Ligand binder design. Structure first.
Ligand SMILES: [Cl-]
Length: 504
């Protein structure tokens, strides 16, 4: 077919504009492109080829080729387990936004309600002036607190919204369903461009500021954005696919995702220009630098359109569909992955329920009055950050050096009929492991505290929690190496020979 439908998700329309604005905009595109061509394509091709060659799931696929490096198989599951916990919180806010839109006038368009303070200004017909949209996002949807040290009470309204999300996916495609996001994204893009003052937002988006490139954060959260959007170190090995066009896929599939992210991001910054023009405030400080950005720019565009409620209900439906089509795959893969002993057969209907309840109660802690602060730690340390950089290094080293790139190339040529260009092999051997290690060391040397919204500075134990969350997935590989060395064959090159020959 021509429409794969596997070229979009919440990682494209929610995360990418969030990261670009936070890092300063414009200067974020240069590290993005470097990772895109030299660490985004070769690794994706390696995952797909390795998955299809063995026709076998990731946990045992590494046993087939890299018996010493089983820690890669276990590391991806821990990252996926962390991801399922906080990837559904976004659908908690989307449902809450949707429920408020089933009325004539949108509550966030106009000020003068209980949550709005005395500083509300319509700006549609100026010191310490706030837009009504930001007040709606912060005071009632989040009810932000002073800091992480105040967890506070639990938001009851958000609690049941999360319950609904889970319930719906406990039972979790037509062409119209697949092309629904693209039509809506185009409609939103048209409205933003024609808006007055959008030229500043585009100039802010494209023209880079080379002074900020020296900051280690920009490099860390660009390549990690590439890895997160592609689902590279979260389970990507596909047994299905028969004997194919694996190389031809990335020239079409694993590159067009970046185009969608770029186009979708283009729409948001057009709206941010209009708000800056209206309020007469620099684009740098016109909005919130945290995760809650797609909930401040998109509602403004939807309330600047005729028939506002009709457009309002649909876009949140698009977000709900995007989240549902992406989390059920992960929750199915993780449950299937733990089934490798098969003690007995309602096992298929018991683990699926057991996993959901644990995730619901552990996803409930970030729905309280101090939930945004803990959500920020989850987004920066678990399922991202150093966890993806570390695993990507060990993946390319084993196949590139231990197993042998030339042997793998021969198998790929056998499978598809021709040998891919030699550039990919050099990537695997030197480029990706070197760049990832360099970024790791650069970030470690110039360690600066992470700040929420560039205002709040976390306490010591917050950074400690983040570091433990990263280590919980970063420490599976050396531990397995030590265990395998100590047990089975202990010493001498005999164990070294056994721990390198692939399974026959
Ligand atoms: Cl992306």
């Amino acid at each position: 077919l021509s429409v794969a439908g596997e070229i979009i998700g919440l990682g494209n329309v929610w995360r990418f504009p969030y990261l670009c604005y936070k890092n300063g905009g414009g200067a974020f595109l240069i590290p993005y492109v470097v990772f895109f061509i030299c660490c985004g394509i070769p690794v994706f091709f390696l995952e797909t080829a390795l998955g299809q060659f063995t026709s076998e799931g990731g946990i045992t696929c590494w046993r087939k080729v890299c018996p010493l490096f089983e820690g890669i198989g276990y590391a991806t599951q821990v990252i996926e387990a962390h991801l399922n916990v906080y990837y559904i919180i976004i659908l908690a806010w989307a449902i809450f936004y949707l429920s408020n839109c089933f009325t004539t006038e949108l509550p966030w368009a106009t000020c003068g309600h209980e949550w709005n303070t005395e500083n509300c200004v319509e700006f549609q017909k100026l010191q310490n002036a706030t837009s009504p949209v930001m007040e709606f996002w912060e005071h009632r949807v989040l009810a932000i607190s002073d800091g992480i040290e105040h967890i506070g009470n639990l938001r009851w309204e958000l609690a049941l919204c999360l319950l609904a999300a889970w319930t719906i996916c406990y039972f979790c495609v037509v062409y119209v369903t697949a092309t629904f996001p693209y039509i809506m994204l185009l409609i939103l893009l048209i409205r933003g461009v024609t808006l007055p003052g959008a030229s500043e937002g585009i100039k802010f988006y494209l023209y880079p500021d080379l002074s900020r490139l020296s900051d280690p954060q920009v490099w860390v959260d660009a390549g990690t954005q590439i890895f997160f959007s592609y689902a590279i170190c979260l389970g990507c090995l596909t047994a299905l696919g028969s004997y194919n066009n694996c190389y031809r896929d990335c020239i079409m599939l694993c590159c067009l995702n970046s185009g969608t992210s770029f186009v979708a991001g283009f729409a948001i910054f057009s709206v941010l220009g209009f708000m800056a023009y209206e309020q007469g405030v620099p684009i740098a400080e016109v909005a919130e630098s945290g995760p809650g950005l797609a909930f401040i720019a998109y509602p403004k565009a939807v309330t600047m359109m005729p028939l506002s409620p009709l457009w309002a209900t649909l876009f949140f439906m698009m977000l709900i569909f995007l989240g549902l089509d992406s989390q059920f795959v992960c929750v199915e893969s993780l449950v299937t992955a733990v089934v490798d002993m098969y003690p007995k057969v309602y096992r298929r209907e018991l683990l699926i329920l057991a996993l959901s309840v644990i995730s619901y109660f552990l996803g409930l802690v970030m729905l309280t009055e101090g939930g945004m602060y803990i959500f920020q730690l989850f987004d920066s340390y678990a399922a991202s950050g150093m966890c993806l950089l570390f695993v990507a290094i060990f993946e390319c080293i084993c196949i590139g050096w231990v197993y042998g790139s030339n042997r793998f190339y021969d198998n790929i040529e056998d499978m598809i009929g021709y040998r891919p260009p030699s550039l990919i092999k050099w990537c695997w051997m030197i480029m990706t492991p070197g760049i990832c290690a360099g970024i790791f060391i650069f970030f470690l040397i110039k360690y600066k505290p992470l700040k929420y919204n560039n205002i709040y500075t976390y306490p010591a134990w917050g950074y400690g929690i983040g570091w433990l969350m990263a280590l919980s997935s970063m420490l599976c590989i050396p531990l397995w190496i030590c265990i395998t060395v100590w047990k089975t064959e202990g010493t001498l090159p005999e164990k070294l020979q056994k721990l390198t020959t692939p399974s026959t």
